[PDB]
Amino acid sequence: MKQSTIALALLPLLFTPVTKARTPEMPVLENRAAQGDITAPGGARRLTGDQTAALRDSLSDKPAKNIILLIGDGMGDSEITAARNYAEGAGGFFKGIDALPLTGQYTHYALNKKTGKPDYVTDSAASATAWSTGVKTYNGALGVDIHEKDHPTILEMAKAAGLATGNVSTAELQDATPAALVAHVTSRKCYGPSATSEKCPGNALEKGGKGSITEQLLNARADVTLGGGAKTFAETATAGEWQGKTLREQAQARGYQLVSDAASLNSVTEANQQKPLLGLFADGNMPVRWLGPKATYHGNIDKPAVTCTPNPQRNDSVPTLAQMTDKAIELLSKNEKGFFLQVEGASIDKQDHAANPCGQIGETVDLDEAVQRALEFAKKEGNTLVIVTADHAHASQIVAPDTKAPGLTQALNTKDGAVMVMSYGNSEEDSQEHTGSQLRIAAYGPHAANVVGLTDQTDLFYTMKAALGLK
Amino acid sequence: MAAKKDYYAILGVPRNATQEEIKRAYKRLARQYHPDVNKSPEAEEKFKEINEAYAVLSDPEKRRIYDTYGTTEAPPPPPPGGYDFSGFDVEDFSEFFQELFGPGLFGGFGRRSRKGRDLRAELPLTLEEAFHGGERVVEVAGRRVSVRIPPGVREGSVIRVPGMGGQGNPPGDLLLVVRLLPHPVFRLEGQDLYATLDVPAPIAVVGGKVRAMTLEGPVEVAVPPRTQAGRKLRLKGKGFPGPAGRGDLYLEVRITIPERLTPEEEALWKKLAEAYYARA
Amino acid sequence: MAAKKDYYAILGVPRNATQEEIKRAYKRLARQYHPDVNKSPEAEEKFKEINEAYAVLSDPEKRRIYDTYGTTEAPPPPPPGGYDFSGFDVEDFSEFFQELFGPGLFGGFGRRSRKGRDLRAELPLTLEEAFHGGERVVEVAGRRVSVRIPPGVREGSVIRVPGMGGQGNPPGDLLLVVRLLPHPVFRLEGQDLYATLDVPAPIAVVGGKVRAMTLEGPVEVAVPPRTQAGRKLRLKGKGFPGPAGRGDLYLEVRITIPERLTPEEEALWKKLAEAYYARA
């Protein structure tokens, strides 16, 4: 339609939204129908072997490397000093409780040197322990979990522990150099409580079990390869379900390929492993990371209306629901006596002995949230688009299908259709030949080389491949 | 005033007991003296003494506070927030406890004793390490304490830890607002994720395969014959872990082209373009 | 005593003069007797009478109040808010003004012609009108103001206009921070337009003409070659004058594919997809 004329906001108040059909968190839907999930029989990480490649070679990067970053040196020490211990304190006097913890700069302990080069596969790790894993205990009832308040307290010291390393990893454990998990208060910023989480779960720590052993942190080796090892992918349909995937693999090419299918036009290029049924580089998105956080919204603050939450078990089933018994753990029957324990420095306190699940660690816990970790917030959908993003149609322009129904028309939801039709919209869009037309496309593609040469400078390159599209 | 209660003896473990076996003794007496299971105020106060001993012998920090007590004699300096007492009625514990944790005695079930300092902490975390998470110790507001948070998180969103915040009776608790790394692809809702899949136009039309790199392993996505951008996947059992299985990864389809082509490729793409121009 | 201030003659125009003639009259006298440059009492009091004249004849309603007065004898009823007097010196101007507009001289909640305070508001403005440039009918708080927007007015442009701010007879010094509409084509920000382009894969790679909507109607735009989804197509000369001389356009690419296919086209698409996937 023809809006043209306008109004003003004034900012007298903040317009609150209207509630819609949302949150079926009360009749629990298990969602295990056509789930697949555990289809591969165990699988695990395939990390083991009587040494396989990299021995002697190990990729020689960095000038010796040896003690990575924190070399220190002492007599040639610089820069890194200012990062931490830029003062020391007192060489002796009181502060100097030691002076030489290096001991001739590292004696024959075993090899030392850090580096992280000799081997990446030769280990006795079962390669199933991917750091840790926990479910939401049981299916239960779900719902009730809201809680969210805000914070009268913000900021602290800083504690930018790791800031690049730490609890980062890749699929499996690859590094662990923070405080332990993380460490600090909201010391940079905070969006909002019920803005980002209308329902923050927390009472859901499952159970755990079958452990009593965790000393083998090394899944693979160290730093560069501390986990994963080898996880190949090649299967008909490991995806799931969407739109209408008829079970068809396709995409083979093998028909002629001029001379032969296996490379043919190329013999070898370093290693690469490109043209191997799928590879090159591919896979966009990768870091993604949006700089636009939509909104902060500091509202729906405190609201201590949550009655049920500080109750540690009351009217429950029994703390023997989750797995009942995993093995034993409490009575492990390992040794006839409580070890030898003479003087091991201390006792084996460790913060651990056999882990052993807490009383009612995961089974309802009155609130029921022990078996829940939210479910609804904003699935988004997106199919609400296409239906005139100006006037919203409101019959007339389109009356019979509001949305979902478009099936005879096909297109299947669509959502991304900012043009398609849009313009005119059964209304008087005058248009005519006007000055607004003025355009000159300078997007990627028509730049340099063919256009007006490279540029008006000695900045010029012969980088133009004809037979293959390459820079 | 110097009425040192032996927390090991309160739980019935020896002066050598491991933190884990201390917790075993807790579980025994947490079943025995459980407030609502055993309808006896007597047993609730005894349960408080069980929760007192456990309050000081639960986590690495508190454990070593007691272990260093009787070497150190001065009570620990107040952590800017308070001493956390998740389900532990600090206010009704011993005057010895009121020495050792005095400057930040919380007020858990003291009915007013403080207003809960709602301790909201931001944390740099990964999606694969959201999947991992587990039983780990965090230092927030000068206050080191361990928790097993439910494996799973979404950018900017909040993880609750009930009771484990600053001083108060009305639950202040710990509120972990996650700061995801340069990798926030998988946006969580419950167990279900929301990422974006880079699908080539030719693969989208034939219904071939495109790899989505997931938390526990790289899944190879089977695409239907002819897929548009804006379509959505639900990869069954590729979310965060649940009782019946993992949630569903929701992938937003992008139809994308490799820009650069071979003479063969580009020729057929131009014949498709000619088929399009022929529609006008 | 109803001393008929001939607002036209004050502006130096006849009693048949339109809002246009009132406008250029005011501007002529606003440059000539410009009190910021020509700080001389005579020229400044005279200038304020030119602002009395303009005050009444700026806004469509207040305009019609003058026009009807001397045909109708009763003062035309005050809008829901009162009679605006955009930062003009009420207590110095004519009896005629203060008797005609007297019954509803605004004053916010004071009513006795008190001044309005500075305020900041968001002006949601139609993209088409932002191109054209001229007087804009903005109605809010009872008042319908005619604010002349700059030709090619861009996001965050603050029009400091008294009359729509704090409540008063000469109402508040408002800051119109221009927010251009969620109109389905563009959002002009900085100097350049932000739009969306849903384009099919053959036309994206090869670079064919689609119908791209513009502020004065849709035009045929030959899409650049090798156009990939998730990217922004820079089309220069589409955006408005600013830092970059003139601004660009940035089209948010969403590539689609035909969905419905006939055997031969499907054979070409698959042969692309096979020689792609297998030989990636």
Beta-bridge partners for A440:
C236
Chains that touch C (3 or more CB pairs under 8 A): A, B
List alpha helices for B142-250, DSSP H: 201-206
Give CA–CA dist B210/B222, Å, rounded.
Answer: 7
Q: Residues of A annotated in the binding site for Mg(2+), as ranges?
A: 175, 177, 344
Give the nearest chain B residue to A128 (CA atoms).
Answer: B216
CA dihedral for B85, B89, B90, B94, sign (positive or negative)? negative
Whether A441 sits inside 8 A of C123 (CB atoms) is: no
Q: What is the DSSP letter of A313?
A: S
CA trace torsion A225, A227, A232, A236 (10° rounding): -150
- Who's near A182: CB < 8 A, 6+ residues apart? A161, A166, A167, B121, B123, B124, B125, B138, B176
Residues from chain C that touch B228, judged by Cβ atoms under 8 A, are: 256-257, 259
Residue type at A28?
Answer: V
Say how far apart CA B124 and CA A168 lie, in whole Å.
9
| Technique of determination | NMR
Distance CA(A129)–CA(A173), nearest Å, equals: 9
Answer positive or negative: Cα dihedral of A262, A264, A270, A272. Answer: negative
Among residues A4, A78, A124, A267, which one is catalytic?
A124
Whole-number Å distance between alpha carbons of A96 and A433: 85
CB contact under 8 A, A412 and C259: yes
Could you give the CA distance from residue B131 to residue B216 in angstroms, rounded to a whole number? 8
C262, two tokens: 């006939």
Q: Please, which residues have CB within 8 angstroms of residue C30's CB and are 6 or more apart in sequence?
A: C47, C50
What are the backbone dihedrals phi and psi of residue C271, each rounded to the nearest 5 degrees, phi first? -65, -35
In this structure, what token pair is assigned to residue A217? 């942190």
Taking the CA of residue B95 and the nearest CA in chain A, the distance in Å comes to: 24
Sign of the alpha-carbon dihedral angle for C137, C139, C145, C148: negative
**Of the candidates A257, A269, A248, A465, the residue with the CA atom closest to the CA atom of residue C275:** A257
Write the CA distances from A203 to A105, A156, A361, B151, C124, integer angstroms. 49, 26, 9, 12, 45
CB contact under 8 A, A7 and C138: yes
Among the partner residues B126, B236, B263, nearest to A35 by beta-carbon distance: B236
Residue count of chain A, please give it.
Answer: 471
Q: Which residues, 6 or more positions from A15, have their beta carbon under 8 angstroms from its beta carbon?
A: none
- Which residue among A11, A253, A436 sits closest to C274, beta carbon to beta carbon? A253
Q: How far is CA B193 from CA A33, A205, B237, in A?
A: 18, 20, 10
Q: Which amino acid is at B115?
A: K
Strand partners for B146: B137
CATH class of B7-104: mainly alpha
CA distances B266 to A446, B175, B201, C208, C275, Å, are: 17, 54, 13, 14, 12
Distance between CA C226 and CA C228 in Å, rounded? 6
What residues in C contact A435, CB-CB < 8 Å? 216
Which pair of structure tokens corresponds to residue C221? 């735009």
CB C86 within 8 A of CB C58: yes
Taking chain A, what is the end-to-end CA distance rounded to the nearest angstrom?
48
Strands B217-222 and A440-441: unpaired
Query: Which residue in chain C has the smallest CA separation from A282?
Result: C280
Q: Is A140 left (phi over 0), alpha (psi -120 to 50) or beta?
A: left
Alpha-carbon distance A333 to A328, whole Å?
9
Are the Cβ atoms of B265 and C254 closer than 8 angstroms? no
Question: Is the Cβ–Cβ distance between A150 and A298 less than 8 Å?
Answer: yes
CB contact under 8 A, C205 and B261: yes
Is some CB atom of chain C closer than 8 A to the CB atom of B277? yes
User: Which chain A residues contact residue C131 at CB under 8 A?
Assistant: 436
Nearest CA in chain A to C198: A417
Rounded CA gap, B39 and A177, in Å? 47
- Please write down the long-range contacts of A339-346, taking CB distance under 8 Å and 24 or more positions apart: A341/B16
Give yes or no: A197 in active site: no
C-alpha dist (Å) from residue B74 to B65, B78, B95, B102: 11, 12, 15, 11
b (16+ CB within 10 A) / e for A233-259: eeeebbbbbbbebeeeebbebeeeeee
Of C168, C121, C166, C113, the closest CA to residue C147 belongs to: C121
**Neighbour count for residue B174 (Cβ, 10 Å):** 29
Chain A hits for C123, Cβ within 8 Å:
6, 8-9
- Other chains touching B, judged by 3 or more CB pairs under 8 Å: A, C
Tokens standing for residue B9: 């003896």
B20 with A351: Cβ contact below 8 A: yes
Q: Is B64 on the interface with C (CB under 8 A)?
A: no
Give the side-chain half-sphere CA count within 13 A for B258: 22
| DSSP per position, A42-86 | S-------S--S-TTTS---SSS-SS-STT--SSS--SHHHHS-T
Residues of C in contact with B255 (CB under 8 A): 201, 229, 254-257
Where does residue C180 rank: exposed (0-12), middle (13-18), buried (19+ CB within 10 A)? buried
- Contact, B188 vs B213, CB < 8 A? no
Question: Of B63, B124, B207, which has the smallest distance from its Cβ to A182's Cβ?
Answer: B124
Q: Which of A282, A309, A469 has its CB closest to that of B171?
A: A309
Q: Using a CB–CB cutoff of 8 Å, tell me whether C229 touches chain B.
A: yes
CB A140 within 8 A of CB A371: yes
Q: How many whole angstroms separate alpha carbon A62 and alpha carbon A77? A: 18
What Rg, from alpha-carbon coordinates, does chain B have?
A: 28
Cα–Cα distance measured from residue A366 to residue A145, given in angstroms and rounded to the nearest whole number: 12
Please state, in angstroms and rounded to a whole number, the distance separating the CA atoms of residues C36 and C71. 38
Cα–Cα nearest to B152, from B212, B92, B109, B216? B216
Q: Say yes or no for a CB contact (<8 Å) between A439 and C164.
A: no
Q: Which are the contacts of C234, defined by CB distance < 8 A and separation ≥ 6?
A: A441, A442, A443, A444, C248, C249, C250
Nearest CA in chain B to C270: B206
> Which tokens belong to A2?
């023809």
C-alpha A398, offset from chain centre: 41
Contact A191, A155 (CB under 8 A): no
**Binding site residue list of A:** 73, 175, 177, 344, 349, 353, 391-392, 434
Q: Is B201 on the interface with C (CB under 8 A)?
A: yes
> What is the DSSP track for B17-61?
--HHHHHHHHHHHHHHT-TTTTT-HHHHHHHHHHHHHHHHHSSHH
Q: What Cα–Cα distance (Å) separates residue A56 from each residue in A51, A425, B187?
A: 11, 71, 43
Contacts of A183 (CB under 8 A, 6+ apart): A159, A161, B138, B139, B140
Cβ neighbours for C275, distance < 8 A, ≥ 6 positions apart? A253, B262, B264, B265
Phi, psi for B177 (deg, rounded to 5): -85, 110
Q: State chain B's maximal CA–CA distance in angstroms.
A: 95
Give contacts of B219 with chain A, Cβ < 8 Å: 233, 238-239
Cross-chain CB nearest to A233 (options B19, B135, B211): B211
Instruction: Match 């010895």 to its residue by tokens.
Output: B96
| Inter-chain CB proximity B264 and C274 less than 8 Å | no
Q: What is the DSSP string of A201-215?
A: ---------S-S---
What is the count of residue pairs from A and B with beta carbons less than 8 Å apart? 375
Chain A residue closest in CA terms to C240: A436
Q: Alpha-carbon distance A334 to C101, whole Å? A: 98
Give the separation between CA B97 and CA A110, rounded to whole angstroms.
Answer: 47
Three-state SS at B174: strand
Assigned CATH topology for domain C119-180: HSP40/DNAj peptide-binding domain (2.60.260)
Contact A8 C138 (CB under 8 A): yes
Query: Residue A22 corresponds to which tokens in the numbers above?
Result: 């949302």
Strands in C97-248 per DSSP E: 119-125, 134-140, 143-149, 158-162, 173-180, 193-200, 209-212, 219-222, 232-236, 241-242, 245-246
From C84, C187, C130, C136, select the one nearest A6 (Cα to Cα).
C136
Q: Find the residue in A nearest to B115 (Cα).
A: A152
Q: How many Å lie between the alpha carbon of A435 and the closest alpha carbon of chain C? A: 8
> Is there a contact between B78 and B103 (Cβ–Cβ < 8 Å)?
yes
> Does the distance separating the beta carbons of B261 and C256 come in below 8 Å?
no
| Overall residue count recorded for chain C in this entry | 280
CB distance C121 to C174 below 8 Å: yes
Q: How far apart are CA C212 and CA A34, in angstroms?
A: 43
Q: How do B119-125 and C119-125 pair as beta strands? A: unpaired
Q: Which residues pair with B180 in a beta bridge?
A: B125
A245–B121: do the CB atoms touch at under 8 Å? no
